[PDB]
Design a protein around this ligand. Structure first.
Ligand SMILES: [Mg+2]
Ligand code: NA
Length: 331
DNA sequence: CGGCAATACG
DNA sequence: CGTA
DNA sequence: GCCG
């Protein structure tokens, strides 16, 4: 069988329906470009269902009984099985609207609304945006200047170098503080487009005011190309690191998050992803268990109490779910 | 229809 | 609006 | 788009 929520099933990084899931995610992405979050979500879910399957889908009948597969998603798979291509998907791929929206939304500091506005104004290329720099935010300027690097896959080797750099600065800012690699790379990805770190300290309260000290020490080593700090919500910094390369360097998006150790398991769970996994997990928590989950804790609205967690295993237990290791959360 | 994760901070 |  |  196949449970309805992605958090109820192991989803490996690599699977047996790559072509089909990729096609459905094109439509998901396109739906988001047109402001259709509901449709995006369904296409994302349907694609994730195929990721969780134990073998390739070869016939349309194998879609029977599968959640989030209705008339539209089944037709897409049906055409792919029969012709090798889905005309709607190909029509989307080739369209100027999709290509331009995809180009713009990949820019750091540019979301759908902004990308949509720029498109309606007649803008189509990166150079179009560069010709009118006066109307760009500092965040967008940085994303535009470093677009080529940020669009280049980050390798696991790169991540390890970045971690030792972060751990060095963190170690000086607060002795005893720890750094944990999260996000996609914790889920076993061999390459990605950004890096996420979670920072904490074994003694509750000592992690307070840590990130400004960390950022200052990183800035002193000339490693920060862009910095956006958010105060404690955990204290967070969305950065662009200068990562040393053979004879040169490249820009990499790095997120630093500091959480008190008491909330660390919730922060780790939220920041490990995947994005769809977390959305599904929180949807499951609220609608099936009547509990409110976020990156900070798990709230029982009936008893008005927060669940204490010492580990991710605790959280899955609280929600009555079988534990899933990070590399099985690739929904 | 009513919902679709989360929600503070820049 | 954007970041997550 | 799909679910209830
Ligand atoms: Mg990130
Ligand atoms: Na982005």
């Amino acid at each position: 069988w196949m449970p309805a929520y992605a958090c109820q099933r192991p989803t490996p990084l690599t699977h047996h329906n790559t072509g089909l899931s990729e096609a459905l995610e094109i439509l998901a992405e396109a739906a988001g470009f047109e402001g259709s979050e509901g449709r995006l979500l369904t296409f994302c879910r349907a694609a994730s269902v195929l990721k969780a399957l134990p073998s390739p889908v070869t016939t349309l009948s194998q879609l029977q009984g599968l959640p989030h597969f209705g008339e539209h998603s089944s037709r897409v798979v049906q055409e792919l099985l029969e012709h090798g291509v889905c005309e709607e998907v190909e029509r989307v791929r080739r369209s100027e609207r999709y290509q331009t929206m995809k180009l713009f939304t990949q820019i750091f500091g540019v979301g759908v609304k902004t990308a949509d506005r720029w498109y309606r104004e007649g803008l189509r290329t990166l150079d179009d945006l560069r010709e009118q720099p006066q109307k760009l935010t500092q965040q967008q300027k940085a994303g535009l200047q470093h677009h080529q690097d940020l669009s280049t896959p980050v390798l696991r080797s790169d991540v390890d170098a970045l971690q030792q750099v972060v751990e060095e600065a963190v170690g000086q800012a607060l002795p005893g503080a720890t750094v944990t690699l999260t996000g996609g790379f914790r889920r076993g990805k061999l390459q990605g487009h950004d890096v996420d770190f979670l920072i904490t300290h074994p003694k509750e309260g000592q992690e307070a005011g840590l990130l400004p000290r960390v950022m200052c020490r990183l800035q002193d080593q000339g490693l920060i190309l862009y910095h956006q700090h958010q105060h404690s919500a955990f204290e967070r910094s969305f950065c662009i690191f200068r990562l040393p390369q053979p004879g040169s360097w490249k820009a990499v998006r790095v997120d630093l998050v500091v959480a008190p150790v008491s909330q660390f398991p919730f922060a780790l769970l939220g920041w490990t992803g995947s994005k769809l996994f977390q959305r599904e997990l929180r949807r499951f928590s609220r609608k099936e268990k009547g509990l409110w989950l976020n990156s900070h804790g798990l709230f029982d609205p009936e008893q008005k109490t927060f669940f204490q967690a010492a580990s991710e295993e605790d959280i899955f237990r609280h929600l009555g779910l079988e534990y899933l290791p990070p590399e099985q959360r690739n929904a």
